[PDB]
Protein backbone atom coordinates (compact mmCIF):
# COMPACT_ATOMS: atom_id res chain seq x y z
CA UNK A 1 0.00 0.00 0.00
CA UNK A 2 0.98 3.66 -0.47
CA UNK A 3 1.01 6.55 2.00
CA UNK A 4 -1.57 9.01 0.64
CA UNK A 5 -2.83 12.19 2.28
CA UNK A 6 -5.94 13.38 0.39
CA UNK A 7 -6.05 17.16 -0.16
CA UNK A 8 -7.22 19.25 2.79
CA UNK A 9 -9.39 22.38 2.64
CA UNK A 10 -7.69 25.19 0.70
CA UNK A 11 -8.80 27.69 3.33
CA UNK A 12 -7.10 25.66 6.05
CA UNK A 13 -3.90 25.42 3.97
CA UNK A 14 -3.99 29.14 3.18
CA UNK A 15 -4.09 30.11 6.89
CA UNK A 16 -1.03 27.94 7.52
CA UNK A 17 0.82 29.79 4.77
CA UNK A 18 -0.26 33.16 6.20
CA UNK A 19 1.63 32.24 9.38
CA UNK A 20 4.79 31.94 7.27
CA UNK A 21 4.20 35.14 5.36
CA UNK A 22 5.46 37.71 7.93
CA UNK A 23 8.82 35.89 7.98
CA UNK A 24 9.29 36.71 4.30
CA UNK A 25 10.11 40.30 5.32
CA UNK A 26 12.44 39.36 8.16
CA UNK A 27 15.76 39.19 6.33
CA UNK A 28 18.20 39.72 9.20
CA UNK A 29 20.62 36.81 9.53
CA UNK A 30 19.25 35.91 12.97
CA UNK A 31 15.84 35.40 11.37
CA UNK A 32 16.79 34.05 7.92
CA UNK A 33 15.39 30.55 7.62
CA UNK A 34 16.22 28.24 4.67
CA UNK A 35 13.62 25.74 5.89
CA UNK A 36 10.86 28.34 5.47
CA UNK A 37 11.91 29.00 1.85
CA UNK A 38 12.03 25.27 1.07
CA UNK A 39 8.68 24.56 2.68
CA UNK A 40 7.04 27.37 0.72
CA UNK A 41 8.53 26.37 -2.66
CA UNK A 42 7.33 22.78 -2.13
CA UNK A 43 3.86 23.99 -1.15
CA UNK A 44 0.82 25.00 -3.21
CA UNK A 45 1.38 28.55 -1.96
CA UNK A 46 3.75 31.34 -2.97
CA UNK A 47 4.91 34.78 -1.81
CA UNK A 48 5.75 36.07 -5.29
CA UNK A 49 8.66 38.49 -5.61
CA UNK A 50 9.31 38.29 -1.86
CA UNK A 51 10.74 34.80 -2.45
CA UNK A 52 13.46 36.02 -4.78
CA UNK A 53 14.62 38.62 -2.26
CA UNK A 54 14.55 35.96 0.44
CA UNK A 55 16.80 33.62 -1.55
CA UNK A 56 19.10 36.51 -2.37
CA UNK A 57 19.42 37.29 1.35
CA UNK A 58 20.16 33.62 2.05
CA UNK A 59 22.92 33.57 -0.57
CA UNK A 60 24.43 36.82 0.74
CA UNK A 61 24.38 35.76 4.37
CA UNK A 62 25.50 32.15 4.08
CA UNK A 63 28.27 32.74 1.55
CA UNK A 64 29.74 35.84 3.21
CA UNK A 65 29.58 34.45 6.74
CA UNK A 66 31.04 31.03 6.00
CA UNK A 67 33.64 32.05 3.42
CA UNK A 68 34.54 35.62 4.34
CA UNK A 69 28.46 38.34 10.43
CA UNK A 70 26.74 38.18 13.79
CA UNK A 71 26.45 34.56 14.89
CA UNK A 72 27.00 33.04 11.44
CA UNK A 73 25.07 29.91 10.42
CA UNK A 74 25.80 26.36 11.57
CA UNK A 75 26.73 23.45 9.31
CA UNK A 76 23.27 21.94 9.85
CA UNK A 77 21.76 25.22 8.68
CA UNK A 78 24.14 25.18 5.70
CA UNK A 79 22.62 21.82 4.79
CA UNK A 80 19.13 23.38 4.74
CA UNK A 81 20.51 26.25 2.67
CA UNK A 82 21.55 23.59 0.15
CA UNK A 83 17.94 22.34 0.08
CA UNK A 84 16.88 25.93 -0.58
CA UNK A 85 19.11 26.01 -3.67
CA UNK A 86 17.44 22.84 -5.00
CA UNK A 87 14.05 24.45 -4.33
CA UNK A 88 15.04 27.08 -6.88
CA UNK A 89 16.35 24.46 -9.36
CA UNK A 90 19.98 25.36 -8.68
CA UNK A 91 23.00 23.18 -8.10
CA UNK A 92 25.59 24.53 -5.69
CA UNK A 93 28.35 25.75 -7.99
CA UNK A 94 31.33 28.01 -8.60
CA UNK A 95 34.34 28.39 -6.33
CA UNK A 96 32.19 29.71 -3.49
CA UNK A 97 29.79 26.80 -3.94
CA UNK A 98 32.54 24.16 -4.07
CA UNK A 99 33.98 25.47 -0.80
CA UNK A 100 30.61 25.32 0.93
CA UNK A 101 30.24 21.70 -0.15
CA UNK A 102 33.62 20.77 1.32
CA UNK A 103 32.76 22.54 4.57
CA UNK A 104 29.63 20.39 4.88
CA UNK A 105 31.71 17.31 4.00
CA UNK A 106 34.14 18.30 6.80
CA UNK A 107 31.19 18.54 9.20
CA UNK A 108 30.23 14.95 8.36
CA UNK A 109 33.83 13.75 8.58
CA UNK A 110 34.23 15.33 12.04
CA UNK A 111 30.99 13.76 13.27
CA UNK A 112 32.13 10.41 11.87
CA UNK A 113 35.37 10.76 13.84
CA UNK A 114 33.48 11.81 16.98
CA UNK A 115 31.18 8.78 16.71
CA UNK A 116 34.23 6.53 16.38
CA UNK A 117 35.05 3.16 14.82
CA UNK A 118 33.29 1.62 17.83
CA UNK A 119 30.05 3.67 17.47
CA UNK A 120 29.94 4.58 21.21
CA UNK A 121 30.79 8.27 20.95
CA UNK A 122 27.94 10.65 20.20
CA UNK A 123 28.00 13.13 17.36
CA UNK A 124 28.69 16.66 18.64
CA UNK A 125 25.31 17.56 17.19
CA UNK A 126 22.60 14.96 16.51
CA UNK A 127 22.03 12.02 14.20
CA UNK A 128 19.24 14.21 12.80
CA UNK A 129 21.81 16.71 11.52
CA UNK A 130 24.08 13.87 10.40
CA UNK A 131 21.26 12.51 8.20
CA UNK A 132 20.30 16.01 7.05
CA UNK A 133 23.89 16.64 5.93
CA UNK A 134 24.05 13.43 3.90
CA UNK A 135 20.69 14.24 2.31
CA UNK A 136 21.72 17.80 1.42
CA UNK A 137 24.92 16.62 -0.30
CA UNK A 138 23.09 13.82 -2.10
CA UNK A 139 20.46 16.26 -3.45
CA UNK A 140 23.27 18.15 -5.14
CA UNK A 141 24.72 14.87 -6.43
CA UNK A 142 27.72 15.16 -4.10
CA UNK A 143 29.02 11.81 -2.83
CA UNK A 144 30.05 10.82 0.71
CA UNK A 145 32.22 7.82 1.55
CA UNK A 146 30.73 4.47 2.65
CA UNK A 147 32.36 4.97 6.06
CA UNK A 148 30.22 8.11 6.48
CA UNK A 149 27.00 6.36 5.50
CA UNK A 150 27.93 3.44 7.79
CA UNK A 151 27.43 5.55 10.93
CA UNK A 152 23.86 6.35 9.92
CA UNK A 153 23.23 2.71 8.96
CA UNK A 154 24.49 1.41 12.33
CA UNK A 155 22.37 3.97 14.17
CA UNK A 156 19.14 2.49 12.78
CA UNK A 157 20.13 -1.13 12.11
CA UNK A 158 19.29 -4.06 14.47
CA UNK A 159 20.98 -4.02 17.90
CA UNK A 160 21.85 -0.35 17.52
CA UNK A 161 22.88 1.56 20.63
CA UNK A 162 20.76 4.46 21.84
CA UNK A 163 17.20 5.50 21.09
CA UNK A 164 16.25 7.82 18.23
CA UNK A 165 13.10 9.91 17.84
CA UNK A 166 10.64 9.54 14.98
CA UNK A 167 12.00 12.83 13.57
CA UNK A 168 15.55 11.49 13.51
CA UNK A 169 14.54 8.17 11.94
CA UNK A 170 12.47 10.00 9.30
CA UNK A 171 15.38 12.29 8.40
CA UNK A 172 17.66 9.23 8.16
CA UNK A 173 15.12 7.50 5.93
CA UNK A 174 15.02 10.54 3.66
CA UNK A 175 18.82 10.50 3.37
CA UNK A 176 18.81 6.74 2.61
CA UNK A 177 16.09 7.27 -0.02
CA UNK A 178 18.11 9.95 -1.80
CA UNK A 179 21.18 7.66 -1.84
CA UNK A 180 19.11 4.80 -3.23
CA UNK A 181 17.36 6.87 -5.92
CA UNK A 182 20.69 8.40 -6.96
CA UNK A 183 22.40 4.97 -7.00
CA UNK A 184 25.04 6.39 -4.65
CA UNK A 185 27.15 4.19 -2.36
CA UNK A 186 26.57 0.99 -4.39
CA UNK A 187 28.77 -0.92 -1.94
CA UNK A 188 26.10 -0.27 0.70
CA UNK A 189 23.08 -0.66 -1.58
CA UNK A 190 21.48 -3.68 0.11
CA UNK A 191 22.00 -2.26 3.60
CA UNK A 192 20.59 1.10 2.48
CA UNK A 193 17.54 -0.72 1.07
CA UNK A 194 17.09 -2.68 4.30
CA UNK A 195 17.54 0.46 6.43
CA UNK A 196 14.69 2.21 4.60
CA UNK A 197 12.35 -0.70 5.45
CA UNK A 198 13.63 -0.67 9.05
CA UNK A 199 12.79 3.03 9.41
CA UNK A 200 9.35 2.41 7.85
CA UNK A 201 8.53 -0.30 10.40
CA UNK A 202 9.79 1.66 13.39
CA UNK A 203 7.80 4.74 12.39
CA UNK A 204 4.61 2.71 11.89
CA UNK A 205 5.16 1.06 15.26
CA UNK A 206 5.48 4.53 16.83
CA UNK A 207 1.94 5.56 15.78
CA UNK A 208 -0.19 6.72 18.75
CA UNK A 209 -3.84 5.75 19.33
CA UNK A 210 -4.75 9.30 18.22
CA UNK A 211 -3.01 8.66 14.90
CA UNK A 212 0.17 10.72 15.19
CA UNK A 213 3.60 9.22 14.54
CA UNK A 214 5.38 9.77 17.85
CA UNK A 215 3.71 13.14 18.41
CA UNK A 216 1.88 15.84 16.41
CA UNK A 217 5.13 17.58 15.44
CA UNK A 218 6.93 14.40 14.35
CA UNK A 219 4.06 13.50 12.00
CA UNK A 220 4.98 15.95 9.19
CA UNK A 221 8.52 14.67 8.65
CA UNK A 222 7.36 11.11 9.25
CA UNK A 223 4.77 11.51 6.50
CA UNK A 224 7.36 13.03 4.16
CA UNK A 225 9.46 9.88 4.52
CA UNK A 226 6.53 7.44 4.31
CA UNK A 227 5.33 9.11 1.09
CA UNK A 228 8.57 8.40 -0.76
CA UNK A 229 8.26 4.60 -1.14
CA UNK A 230 5.77 1.76 -1.18
CA UNK A 231 5.64 -0.55 1.83
CA UNK A 232 4.51 -4.01 0.75
CA UNK A 233 3.01 -6.34 3.35
CA UNK A 234 2.13 -3.42 5.60
CA UNK A 235 -1.06 -1.38 5.72
CA UNK A 236 0.62 1.94 4.99
CA UNK A 237 -2.53 3.42 3.46
CA UNK A 238 -4.56 2.85 6.61
CA UNK A 239 -1.83 4.17 8.88
CA UNK A 240 -1.49 7.35 6.84
CA UNK A 241 -5.25 7.98 6.70
CA UNK A 242 -5.37 7.66 10.48
CA UNK A 243 -2.53 10.19 10.64
CA UNK A 244 -4.50 12.59 8.45
CA UNK A 245 -7.40 12.37 10.88
CA UNK A 246 -5.01 13.16 13.74
CA UNK A 247 -3.37 15.90 11.72
CA UNK A 248 -6.70 17.49 10.78
CA UNK A 249 -7.88 17.57 14.40
CA UNK A 250 -4.58 19.12 15.49
CA UNK A 251 -4.76 21.76 12.75
CA UNK A 252 -8.33 22.74 13.64
CA UNK A 253 -7.16 23.04 17.25
CA UNK A 254 -4.38 25.48 16.35
CA UNK A 255 -1.44 23.10 16.95
CA UNK A 256 0.75 24.53 14.17
CA UNK A 257 1.98 28.02 15.05
CA UNK A 258 5.73 27.58 14.72
CA UNK A 259 7.13 28.60 11.29
CA UNK A 260 9.60 25.70 11.03
CA UNK A 261 6.88 23.15 11.85
CA UNK A 262 4.61 24.70 9.21
CA UNK A 263 7.48 24.59 6.71
CA UNK A 264 7.83 20.84 7.33
CA UNK A 265 4.07 20.24 6.99
CA UNK A 266 3.24 22.35 3.90
CA UNK A 267 5.08 20.05 1.46
CA UNK A 268 3.05 17.08 2.75
CA UNK A 269 -0.21 18.95 2.12
CA UNK A 270 0.95 19.49 -1.48
CA UNK A 271 1.90 15.81 -1.90
CA UNK A 272 5.60 16.70 -1.93
CA UNK A 273 8.63 15.85 0.17
CA UNK A 274 12.30 16.83 0.37
CA UNK A 275 12.98 13.95 -2.07
CA UNK A 276 11.19 16.00 -4.76
CA UNK A 277 14.31 18.21 -4.63
CA UNK A 278 16.14 15.63 -6.74
CA UNK A 279 14.00 16.59 -9.76
CA UNK A 280 12.41 19.90 -8.69
CA UNK A 281 9.43 21.40 -10.55
CA UNK A 282 9.99 25.10 -9.94
CA UNK A 283 7.36 26.46 -12.32
CA UNK A 284 4.39 24.47 -11.02
CA UNK A 285 1.55 26.93 -10.36
CA UNK A 286 1.14 28.13 -6.77
CA UNK A 287 -1.49 30.38 -5.19
CA UNK A 288 -0.32 33.86 -4.25
CA UNK A 289 -0.46 34.39 -0.48
CA UNK A 290 -1.95 37.69 0.64
CA UNK A 291 -1.55 39.05 4.17
CA UNK A 292 -4.37 37.93 6.42
CA UNK A 293 -6.28 41.10 7.06
CA UNK A 294 -6.90 40.53 10.71
CA UNK A 295 -7.67 42.53 13.86
CA UNK A 296 -5.55 41.99 17.01
CA UNK A 297 -7.86 42.32 20.03
CA UNK A 298 -5.85 42.55 23.26
CA UNK A 299 -7.07 40.24 26.07
CA UNK A 300 -8.49 41.86 29.17
CA UNK A 301 -7.70 38.97 31.48
CA UNK A 302 -4.74 38.45 33.80
CA UNK A 303 -3.45 34.95 34.48
CA UNK A 304 -0.90 33.71 37.02
CA UNK A 305 1.71 31.08 36.19
CA UNK A 306 4.10 29.42 38.64
CA UNK A 307 7.66 29.30 37.33
CA UNK A 308 10.02 26.85 39.05
CA UNK A 309 13.60 25.65 38.74
CA UNK A 310 14.64 22.81 41.03
CA UNK A 311 17.90 22.06 39.20
CA UNK A 312 19.71 24.83 41.12
CA UNK A 313 20.48 25.61 44.77
CA UNK A 314 18.85 27.56 46.11
CA UNK A 315 15.77 26.57 44.09
CA UNK A 316 13.51 29.07 42.37
CA UNK A 317 9.73 29.09 42.65
CA UNK A 318 7.59 32.16 41.98
CA UNK A 319 4.05 32.98 40.89
CA UNK A 320 4.15 35.27 37.85
CA UNK A 321 1.23 37.36 36.57
CA UNK A 322 0.92 37.94 32.82
CA UNK A 323 -1.78 38.82 30.26
CA UNK A 324 -3.76 35.80 29.08
CA UNK A 325 -2.28 34.49 25.84
CA UNK A 326 1.30 35.23 26.90
CA UNK A 327 4.04 32.70 26.09
CA UNK A 328 6.47 30.95 28.45
CA UNK A 329 9.04 33.44 27.16
CA UNK A 330 6.81 36.29 28.42
CA UNK A 331 6.72 34.58 31.81
CA UNK A 332 10.53 34.38 31.80
CA UNK A 333 10.81 38.06 30.89
CA UNK A 334 8.44 39.01 33.69
CA UNK A 335 10.36 36.86 36.17
CA UNK A 336 13.56 38.63 35.13
CA UNK A 337 11.89 42.03 35.59
CA UNK A 338 10.74 41.10 39.10
CA UNK A 339 14.36 40.41 40.04
CA UNK A 340 16.08 37.22 41.18
CA UNK A 341 15.83 35.45 37.82
CA UNK A 342 17.97 35.44 34.68
CA UNK A 343 18.18 33.28 31.56
CA UNK A 344 19.77 33.20 28.12
CA UNK A 345 18.56 32.07 24.71
CA UNK A 346 20.15 31.64 21.30
CA UNK A 347 18.58 31.92 17.83
CA UNK A 348 17.66 28.80 15.91
CA UNK A 349 15.47 27.92 12.94
CA UNK A 350 12.75 26.89 15.39
CA UNK A 351 12.96 30.21 17.27
CA UNK A 352 14.58 31.09 20.65
CA UNK A 353 16.34 28.11 22.24
CA UNK A 354 16.78 28.25 26.04
CA UNK A 355 20.47 27.72 26.80
CA UNK A 356 21.01 29.11 30.30
CA UNK A 357 18.93 29.56 33.46
CA UNK A 358 20.00 31.64 36.45
CA UNK A 359 23.63 31.60 35.39
CA UNK A 360 23.73 27.88 34.69
CA UNK A 361 24.37 27.01 31.05
CA UNK A 362 23.61 23.57 29.62
CA UNK A 363 26.75 21.57 28.86
CA UNK A 364 27.59 18.64 26.57
CA UNK A 365 24.62 16.32 25.94
CA UNK A 366 22.58 18.49 28.32
CA UNK A 367 19.63 20.83 27.86
CA UNK A 368 17.08 22.83 29.77
CA UNK A 369 13.87 20.82 29.43
CA UNK A 370 10.50 22.58 29.54
CA UNK A 371 7.71 20.89 31.54
CA UNK A 372 4.16 21.56 32.70
CA UNK A 373 2.29 19.93 35.55
CA UNK A 374 2.45 17.08 36.16
CA UNK A 375 5.98 16.18 34.99
CA UNK A 376 4.92 16.57 31.35
CA UNK A 377 7.44 17.82 28.76
CA UNK A 378 6.18 20.66 26.54
CA UNK A 379 5.75 19.98 22.79
CA UNK A 380 6.47 23.64 22.03
CA UNK A 381 9.31 26.03 22.90
CA UNK A 382 9.29 29.07 25.16
CA UNK A 383 8.06 31.41 22.39
CA UNK A 384 5.16 29.17 21.27
CA UNK A 385 3.76 27.47 24.37
CA UNK A 386 1.02 29.62 25.96
CA UNK A 387 0.33 28.48 29.55
CA UNK A 388 -3.16 28.47 31.04
CA UNK A 389 -4.10 30.18 34.28
CA UNK A 390 -2.82 28.24 37.30
CA UNK A 391 -0.27 26.26 35.31
CA UNK A 392 3.16 25.42 36.71
CA UNK A 393 6.09 25.65 34.29
CA UNK A 394 9.33 23.94 35.21
CA UNK A 395 12.80 24.42 33.75
CA UNK A 396 14.85 21.27 34.38
CA UNK A 397 18.48 20.69 33.46
CA UNK A 398 18.62 17.18 32.05
CA UNK A 399 21.19 14.90 30.46
CA UNK A 400 20.45 12.85 27.31
Amino acid sequence: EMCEIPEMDSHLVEKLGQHLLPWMDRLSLEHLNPSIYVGLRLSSLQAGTKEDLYLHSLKLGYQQCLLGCQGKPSMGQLALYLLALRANCEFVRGHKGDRLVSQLKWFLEDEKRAIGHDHKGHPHTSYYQYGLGILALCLHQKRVHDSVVDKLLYAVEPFHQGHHSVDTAAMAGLAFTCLKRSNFNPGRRQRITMAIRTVQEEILKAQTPEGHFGNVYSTPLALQFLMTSPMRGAELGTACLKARVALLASLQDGAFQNALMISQLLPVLNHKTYIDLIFPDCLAPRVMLEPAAETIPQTQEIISVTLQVLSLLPPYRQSISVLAGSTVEDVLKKAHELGGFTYETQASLSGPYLTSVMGKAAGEREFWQLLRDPNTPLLQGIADYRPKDGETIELRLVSW
Binding site: L60, H95, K96, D98, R143, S147
Partner: protein, 76 residues
Protein backbone atom coordinates in the same frame (compact mmCIF):
# COMPACT_ATOMS: atom_id res chain seq x y z
CA UNK B 1 20.48 52.64 -6.70
CA UNK B 2 22.18 50.55 -4.03
CA UNK B 3 25.00 51.26 -1.51
CA UNK B 4 28.60 51.93 -2.62
CA UNK B 5 31.10 48.99 -2.09
CA UNK B 6 28.36 46.70 -3.42
CA UNK B 7 28.01 46.09 -7.20
CA UNK B 8 24.43 46.05 -8.50
CA UNK B 9 23.37 43.16 -10.78
CA UNK B 10 21.88 45.29 -13.57
CA UNK B 11 19.07 43.07 -14.98
CA UNK B 12 18.02 41.88 -11.52
CA UNK B 13 18.39 45.27 -9.87
CA UNK B 14 19.82 43.26 -6.90
CA UNK B 15 23.00 44.38 -5.17
CA UNK B 16 26.07 42.14 -4.45
CA UNK B 17 29.54 42.65 -2.84
CA UNK B 18 32.70 43.79 -4.70
CA UNK B 19 34.67 40.74 -3.48
CA UNK B 20 32.35 38.91 -5.90
CA UNK B 21 33.21 41.43 -8.62
CA UNK B 22 35.39 39.71 -11.24
CA UNK B 23 35.80 36.51 -9.24
CA UNK B 24 34.95 33.91 -11.90
CA UNK B 25 31.60 33.13 -10.27
CA UNK B 26 28.24 34.05 -11.80
CA UNK B 27 26.59 35.65 -8.77
CA UNK B 28 24.27 37.85 -10.82
CA UNK B 29 21.57 36.45 -13.11
CA UNK B 30 22.87 39.03 -15.64
CA UNK B 31 26.49 37.88 -15.21
CA UNK B 32 27.31 41.59 -15.04
CA UNK B 33 29.56 40.97 -12.02
CA UNK B 34 32.16 39.20 -14.13
CA UNK B 35 32.74 40.86 -17.53
CA UNK B 36 32.30 44.30 -15.90
CA UNK B 37 35.30 45.21 -13.66
CA UNK B 38 51.94 21.83 9.20
CA UNK B 39 51.61 18.03 9.26
CA UNK B 40 48.69 16.08 7.84
CA UNK B 41 46.76 13.75 10.13
CA UNK B 42 47.04 10.02 9.48
CA UNK B 43 44.54 9.00 6.82
CA UNK B 44 44.74 12.43 5.24
CA UNK B 45 46.52 13.68 2.10
CA UNK B 46 47.95 17.10 1.20
CA UNK B 47 46.67 19.17 -1.73
CA UNK B 48 49.50 19.47 -4.27
CA UNK B 49 49.61 23.25 -4.65
CA UNK B 50 48.61 24.30 -1.11
CA UNK B 51 48.72 23.72 2.68
CA UNK B 52 45.38 21.96 2.75
CA UNK B 53 44.80 18.44 4.01
CA UNK B 54 41.77 16.36 3.07
CA UNK B 55 40.79 12.83 4.10
CA UNK B 56 42.06 10.09 1.74
CA UNK B 57 38.46 9.13 1.08
CA UNK B 58 37.90 12.48 -0.69
CA UNK B 59 40.26 11.35 -3.42
CA UNK B 60 38.31 10.63 -6.58
CA UNK B 61 34.86 11.27 -5.04
CA UNK B 62 33.65 13.46 -7.92
CA UNK B 63 34.09 16.81 -6.18
CA UNK B 64 37.17 19.10 -6.13
CA UNK B 65 37.92 19.57 -2.43
CA UNK B 66 41.36 20.94 -3.21
CA UNK B 67 41.76 24.53 -4.51
CA UNK B 68 43.77 23.15 -7.43
CA UNK B 69 41.39 20.19 -7.81
CA UNK B 70 44.38 17.85 -7.50
CA UNK B 71 42.28 15.33 -5.55
CA UNK B 72 40.24 14.60 -8.65
CA UNK B 73 42.93 15.43 -11.26
CA UNK B 74 44.72 12.11 -10.77
CA UNK B 75 41.54 10.15 -11.44
CA UNK B 76 40.88 9.50 -15.14
Amino acid sequence: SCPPTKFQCRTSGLCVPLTWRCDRDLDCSDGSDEEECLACLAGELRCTLSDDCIPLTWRCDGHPDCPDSSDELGCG
